[PDB]
Amino acid sequence: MSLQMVTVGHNIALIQPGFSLMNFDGQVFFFGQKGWPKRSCPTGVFHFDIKQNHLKLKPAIFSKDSCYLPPLRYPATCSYKKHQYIIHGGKTPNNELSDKIYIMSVACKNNKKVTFRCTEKDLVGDVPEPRYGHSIDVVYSRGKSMGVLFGGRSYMPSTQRTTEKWNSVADCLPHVFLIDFEFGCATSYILPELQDGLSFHVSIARNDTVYILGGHSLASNIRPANLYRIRVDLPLGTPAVNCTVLPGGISVSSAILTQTNNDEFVIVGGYQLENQKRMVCSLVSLGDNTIEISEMETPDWTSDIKHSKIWFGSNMGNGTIFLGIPGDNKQSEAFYFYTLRCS
Amino acid sequence: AAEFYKIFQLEIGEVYKHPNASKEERKRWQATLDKHLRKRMNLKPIMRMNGNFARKLMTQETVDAVCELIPSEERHEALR
Amino acid sequence: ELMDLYLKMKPVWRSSCPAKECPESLCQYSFNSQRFAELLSTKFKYRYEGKITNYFHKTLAHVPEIIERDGSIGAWASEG
Amino acid sequence: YHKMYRTVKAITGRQIFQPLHALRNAEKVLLPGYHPFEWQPPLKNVSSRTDVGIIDGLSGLASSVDEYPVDTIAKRFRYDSALVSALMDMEEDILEGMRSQDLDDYLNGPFTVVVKESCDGMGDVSEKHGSGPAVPEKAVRFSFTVMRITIEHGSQNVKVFEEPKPNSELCCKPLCLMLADESDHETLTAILSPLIAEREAMKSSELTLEMGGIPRTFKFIFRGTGYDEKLVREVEGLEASGSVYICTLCDTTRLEASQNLVFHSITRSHAENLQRYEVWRSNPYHESVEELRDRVKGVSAKPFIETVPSIDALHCDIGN
DNA sequence: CCTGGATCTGGCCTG
Ligand SMILES: [Ca+2]
Ligand SMILES: [Zn+2]
């Protein structure tokens, strides 16, 4: 639980809330900059490098056949395994939502060079609506893979939306979607165990089971302490989706997931209420068919974190998260960033 | 009022126990005090001290908001 | 002669209706533009050979087309 | 005014000025949200409420702790309501204009208005003390004027009303005031997209308005001429001010404009920038980044305001 | 013994 302050060079004005870190082969990469991508880096993805508590954001070019994607501001990330990376949904800089799936993978690597490849996957069937704040995961059942997508937040539909309430958002429908990446097919599944919308939840994947927990429901304005488990088996016919409500859940929203050990996850960050901050850390020790969410010791927070109202971060991948604080009135550099080790 | 402002900024850093400090530690003490004064006393921060800032600063509510950021309590009763 | 060319060219993009305020300066804007261009290229070779500011390009290149299209430019300005 | 009225009524005995509650009650006749009006067809994503005045320009942007921190204050008029108010106070001018052109007064022909739009941010507007968000010390105003009104009589087109002093401060009618930064793109798009949605809806319909005992019919043409070069490059999606592509109206580059300097033609548009940004993000030809930018001519972002190809003259004077 | 790129770096364009 070592907590260190991290300085950063001349691109601190590029990190916004809602960024995303992809960990390719122990190397961290930044995505989701602020504003449309400048001529200093036309792709938008960067080389997230820290040593000696100093950070530098070098550019990272794409392949020839890749597609130049907009900087999504609240997407759903996923770690496939020919190792690749799945992003879907989120806000563009012009505040509309995107319904695409982009797949990120390394085209070539040279002596400290990287060139990604980004292709766009087309979804047919029950196409989910463009949204943000949701979550996607992949499961491995009977030697096959399937992308499970739970709902998030979006605008009003295109007939009920008026310009006097144009940016008003509403929680999505609580369906569950099964996305087949190698064919571009999506089938919705309505489940009676899931009644409310949910957004900014954390989701832990396994062989065939996903454990969604936390998450703020907009329509009734609560952060309910629930814990669902979705069991997906893949027979020859339709895949059978089964949600069972479990007890023992916690009540957060937009907390940060990290994987320290195998079958071991830490929950850090997020909010308990509006005026309240989740200042404790939840140790989630998995099993083959069990979830044991327990409280660990808390990391000694400094006084500029204990009195902020906002913070945000993501998972660097190697058991270390990277969170940022709003500095103060912009007037200097507007953000203080930290790092946090987890064993 | 500016002299008391410097006292407040020097008490949240415990300079009576850290008699040496860098530039950046003092800058961070100033930024922390600015954020907490805006959060508590609804005061935007300024570089040139005014008179209305001076009347709104020399209250007991501001020393409660500042005493929220001192670790000790002898410094609390001294500032009080 | 540079300033004479520029003052022959200014009341076309400044007039609120240049076809009914200065048609004589409007009807030969192309000749004054080319004369201004060759005097930038020849007598001022040390500054505008390989680079030119944007508003010089907008002023010399486009504005007969814009004044044919809309009718005025100073009416559609932004001083209001 | 209260001091002046109070001491004039105290000296003369008479009541020369009206007390300011009467001013307030006579003020609401001209503020937005007073008159009846009917769109034909109805406007998409626009309610038909006819009493909407000063509304929060956030338009219900979610201010919770879980998502993107917004820190701007905005107030605005609904666009069609403001166009109705600005058409209704200059009723007498339209009537006198058609009178002086040997037209009737009972005529209800389809008027073609032309409305000149302009937006520019400001600096050093000081933030106040007190409760509220962490507002930046910059303001952005969106405003419009009404340049010409042309009615069709017979076969040809006659004009009725003309703004006689078009760059006045008496005719730049305000529409939206936000405390944002025009450098920032997220909050700018978030505040400004309702007005663009209303304008895009209003571009393809008709307004029916009762003007002096007679219902008459209007339709609009919006021209966004009043933006400086920085805002046009930042909004229409082109590269910034120091690129190698210079002109926001054509595809020329800086060196080849230093060589030719006279012989060009206006080429850029809004729909062309839409097709170009789709070309940039779709990448249909698998080209590398440099030849992609050379194919797409510097378009590398999604435009979100249709701005006409024209030139601001004030900053042209200052630049020369 | 370069040398071919990484990387600054100061000038220029608009506010
Ligand atoms: Ca300005
Ligand atoms: Zn040009």
Side-chain angles (χ1 to χ4, degrees), chain A residues 2-80 83-110 113-329 331-332 334-342, chain B, chain C, chain D:
Chain A
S2 178
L3 165 62
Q4 282 173 345
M5 193 174 48
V6 167
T7 131
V8 59
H10 65 106
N11 308 75
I12 191 183
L14 208 63
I15 295 179
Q16 48 185 6
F19 65 101
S20 74
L21 295 182
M22 31 186 65
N23 201 327
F24 279 76
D25 290 348
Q27 278 198 328
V28 195
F29 291 92
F30 185 84
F31 172 72
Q33 64 157 288
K34 179 172 188 53
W36 289 99
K38 302 306 173 187
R39 193 43 188 154
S40 157
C41 186
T43 69
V45 354
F46 289 88
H47 218 297
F48 207 83
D49 300 336
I50 305 143
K51 0 199 7 120
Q52 311 100 14
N53 296 320
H54 185 86
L55 199 153
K56 279 175 301 296
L57 285 168
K58 302 149 51 187
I61 47 171
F62 278 4
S63 77
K64 275 185 55 55
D65 47 354
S66 163
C67 304
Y68 292 92
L69 84 184
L72 305 177
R73 217 190 318 168
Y74 264 118
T77 42
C78 184
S79 257
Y80 207 72
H83 173 272
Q84 46 187 43
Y85 218 90
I86 287 300
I87 47 177
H88 164 265
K91 292 197 169 116
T92 80
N94 310 355
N95 283 109
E96 73 270 12
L97 312 171
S98 81
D99 43 354
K100 310 304 196 93
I101 285 182
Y102 297 113
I103 320 164
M104 278 290 189
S105 71
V106 169
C108 83
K109 214 181 92 60
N110 303 135
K113 265 118 237 138
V114 109
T115 72
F116 288 97
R117 181 205 318 273
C118 188
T119 23
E120 166 195 14
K121 188 56 69 192
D122 286 73
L123 291 188
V124 323
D126 312 338
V127 225
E129 75 185 37
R131 60 191 78 188
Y132 70 96
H134 59 291
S135 78
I136 192 182
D137 283 323
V138 74
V139 287
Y140 309 100
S141 151
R142 268 192 277 267
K144 276 181 294 306
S145 346
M146 201 58 59
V148 55
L149 185 135
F150 196 38
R153 254 171 209 178
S154 166
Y155 296 148
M156 305 305 180
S158 138
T159 52
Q160 301 171 359
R161 200 181 176 191
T162 176
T163 53
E164 310 169 31
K165 283 303 190 169
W166 186 263
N167 308 337
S168 185
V169 336
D171 266 0
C172 277
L173 279 166
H175 304 165
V176 186
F177 289 79
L178 287 198
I179 298 152
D180 194 57
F181 305 119
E182 58 268 19
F183 275 87
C185 227
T187 64
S188 87
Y189 287 113
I190 307 173
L191 283 91
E193 284 88 348
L194 295 189
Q195 298 293 330
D196 11 34
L198 211 63
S199 279
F200 305 115
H201 54 265
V202 304
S203 339
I204 296 181
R206 264 304 307 275
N207 246 25
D208 77 314
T209 147
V210 190
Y211 303 95
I212 48 176
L213 68 153
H216 172 212
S217 111
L218 173 64
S220 87
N221 202 1
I222 54 169
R223 305 190 161 83
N226 46 5
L227 194 153
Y228 314 111
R229 163 198 49 173
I230 293 95
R231 172 144 315 198
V232 192
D233 51 354
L234 268 260
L236 203 43
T238 178
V241 182
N242 288 111
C243 176
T244 78
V245 176
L246 268 78
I250 68 186
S251 162
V252 294
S253 140
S254 60
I256 307 172
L257 197 66
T258 174
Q259 178 161 349
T260 67
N261 197 76
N262 202 247
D263 271 12
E264 212 61 48
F265 294 91
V266 193
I267 289 299
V268 51
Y271 306 102
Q272 290 170 334
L273 306 169
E274 206 86 36
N275 76 355
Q276 204 54 261
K277 306 151 62 181
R278 170 78 147 185
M279 304 303 296
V280 308
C281 288
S282 256
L283 175 59
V284 179
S285 74
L286 259 67
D288 176 44
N289 213 337
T290 356
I291 296 289
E292 222 268 6
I293 292 182
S294 59
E295 199 175 297
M296 46 159 58
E297 81 284 355
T298 226
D300 214 290
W301 308 101
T302 67
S303 140
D304 45 356
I305 321 171
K306 288 146 58 180
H307 292 105
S308 156
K309 313 155 209 156
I310 310 305
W311 79 107
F312 56 96
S314 60
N315 189 23
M316 318 193 53
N318 49 40
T320 276
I321 75 157
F322 168 74
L323 61 87
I325 312 297
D328 54 294
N329 45 72
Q331 76 173 54
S332 219
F335 279 126
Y336 297 145
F337 293 100
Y338 283 83
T339 195
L340 173 65
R341 274 199 74 252
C342 286
Chain B
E3 180 68 25
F4 275 30
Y5 184 79
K6 286 175 173 185
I7 279 181
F8 289 162
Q9 195 184 140
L10 258 68
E11 270 285 343
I12 79 167
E14 271 205 329
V15 189
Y16 78 103
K17 215 193 296 174
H18 304 340
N20 319 305
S22 90
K23 308 282 193 170
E24 280 323 289
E25 294 162 349
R26 308 173 163 275
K27 272 290 301 297
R28 292 296 321 280
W29 302 338
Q30 181 164 161
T32 288
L33 183 53
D34 276 359
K35 269 209 298 202
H36 202 79
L37 282 191
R38 173 174 257 182
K39 177 194 199 328
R40 283 289 182 275
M41 284 304 109
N42 285 323
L43 297 181
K44 77 154 189 307
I46 46 181
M47 52 168 171
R48 294 171 252 202
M49 284 275 319
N50 292 328
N52 296 334
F53 200 108
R55 298 175 198 100
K56 296 189 74 54
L57 204 67
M58 297 294 114
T59 78
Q60 288 273 316
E61 298 86 296
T62 318
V63 83
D64 302 355
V66 166
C67 274
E68 280 191 3
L69 318 183
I70 304 181
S72 164
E73 290 168 347
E74 310 311 284
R75 326 300 308 159
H76 285 177
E77 71 175 39
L79 268 195
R80 208 138 287 170
Chain C
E1 69 180 321
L2 207 78
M3 187 61 76
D4 165 53
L5 288 184
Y6 177 79
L7 286 170
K8 280 209 212 66
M9 290 165 32
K10 196 186 184 203
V12 184
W13 84 82
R14 287 304 269 154
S15 155
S16 183
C17 182
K20 294 203 308 187
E21 293 181 49
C22 41
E24 297 299 316
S25 82
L26 164 72
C27 80
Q28 49 172 9
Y29 193 95
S30 318
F31 184 38
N32 293 348
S33 318
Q34 294 176 3
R35 191 60 212 181
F36 194 97
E38 63 181 28
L39 288 181
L40 288 179
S41 85
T42 53
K43 297 303 160 192
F44 280 82
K45 220 167 202 177
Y46 67 101
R47 186 175 167 83
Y48 304 128
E49 187 168 47
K51 53 196 197 79
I52 183 176
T53 179
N54 307 338
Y55 274 144
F56 270 42
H57 168 74
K58 286 203 188 68
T59 296
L60 294 156
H62 296 324
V63 320
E65 198 164 320
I66 291 191
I67 204 169
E68 183 263 342
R69 205 193 66 198
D70 303 339
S72 155
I73 300 105
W76 308 92
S78 61
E79 281 191 27
Chain D
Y1 186 88
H2 178 71
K3 276 160 56 180
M4 160 154 85
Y5 149 79
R6 167 178 54 170
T7 203
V8 160
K9 191 190 160 181
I11 287 167
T12 47
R14 275 182 180 152
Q15 192 185 302
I16 310 299
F17 297 124
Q18 320 280 337
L20 67 160
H21 76 87
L23 293 184
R24 200 172 293 115
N25 300 346
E27 174 199 38
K28 317 206 294 276
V29 179
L30 299 141
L31 276 191
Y34 197 75
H35 282 58
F37 54 94
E38 172 198 6
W39 291 99
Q40 184 71 255
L43 298 176
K44 304 290 178 179
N45 291 85
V46 177
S47 52
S48 317
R49 292 299 304 270
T50 49
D51 53 311
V52 176
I54 312 101
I55 46 179
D56 202 359
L58 297 169
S59 54
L61 172 55
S63 160
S64 198
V65 68
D66 294 297
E67 51 199 318
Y68 201 89
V70 69
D71 42 2
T72 81
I73 319 173
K75 282 299 164 49
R76 73 174 178 97
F77 292 144
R78 205 179 75 191
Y79 200 92
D80 44 354
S81 160
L83 259 175
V84 166
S85 274
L87 276 157
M88 270 319 285
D89 59 352
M90 62 172 200
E91 153 188 359
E92 304 287 325
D93 296 333
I94 295 163
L95 295 163
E96 194 269 335
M98 65 175 83
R99 262 197 291 275
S100 48
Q101 298 300 107
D102 315 276
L103 266 62
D104 304 340
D105 275 4
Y106 52 86
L107 188 44
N108 59 329
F111 292 93
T112 296
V113 186
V114 44
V115 171
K116 166 185 136 153
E117 300 185 359
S118 159
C119 167
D120 174 44
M122 295 170 53
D124 306 3
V125 285
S126 89
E127 197 211 321
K128 318 216 168 199
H129 287 243
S131 90
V135 180
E137 59 149 2
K138 312 216 178 311
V140 173
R141 306 180 37 240
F142 200 101
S143 312
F144 70 100
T145 76
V146 193
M147 296 294 298
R148 297 181 286 111
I149 288 185
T150 79
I151 193 186
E152 201 184 8
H153 192 118
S155 63
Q156 56 175 1
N157 217 319
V158 293
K159 53 190 55 189
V160 159
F161 175 74
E162 178 92 33
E163 182 76 42
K165 293 180 167 201
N167 283 334
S168 295
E169 46 181 6
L170 315 166
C171 60
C172 201
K173 312 201 58 77
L175 185 93
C176 166
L177 314 179
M178 73 190 91
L179 260 296
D181 189 10
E182 86 175 0
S183 297
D184 188 279
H185 210 65
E186 277 80 49
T187 71
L188 168 84
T189 37
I191 300 302
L192 207 56
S193 40
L195 305 158
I196 313 298
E198 283 147 345
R199 167 201 189 279
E200 183 64 37
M202 289 156 75
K203 273 150 79 166
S204 74
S205 83
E206 302 291 329
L207 171 61
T208 296
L209 194 54
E210 193 257 3
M211 182 153 290
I214 292 96
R216 301 162 219 273
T217 296
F218 305 96
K219 46 185 197 163
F220 302 94
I221 291 173
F222 313 94
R223 308 188 51 89
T225 47
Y227 310 88
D228 44 346
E229 170 86 6
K230 160 163 183 187
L231 200 58
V232 181
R233 284 174 159 272
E234 209 256 339
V235 165
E236 206 71 37
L238 277 88
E239 282 196 324
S241 299
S243 92
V244 84
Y245 303 92
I246 48 169
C247 171
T248 77
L249 308 97
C250 81
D251 308 342
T252 205
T253 192
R254 181 181 299 272
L255 166 71
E256 88 198 352
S258 175
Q259 296 173 8
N260 164 264
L261 312 102
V262 180
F263 293 156
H264 302 90
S265 43
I266 300 173
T267 319
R268 290 198 147 91
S269 313
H270 194 64
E272 182 178 317
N273 292 18
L274 291 186
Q275 302 150 12
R276 276 180 211 259
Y277 175 65
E278 203 49 62
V279 159
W280 167 266
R281 70 148 306 271
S282 68
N283 199 359
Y285 304 100
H286 316 269
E287 293 165 324
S288 47
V289 53
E290 291 316 278
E291 54 191 4
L292 183 57
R293 198 177 70 106
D294 184 56
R295 159 179 290 270
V296 82
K297 296 302 180 302
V299 169
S300 71
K302 176 68 131 196
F304 82 111
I305 297 172
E306 175 178 50
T307 287
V308 78
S310 175
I311 300 171
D312 173 42
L314 158 75
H315 289 101
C316 203
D317 295 351
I318 299 183
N320 301 12

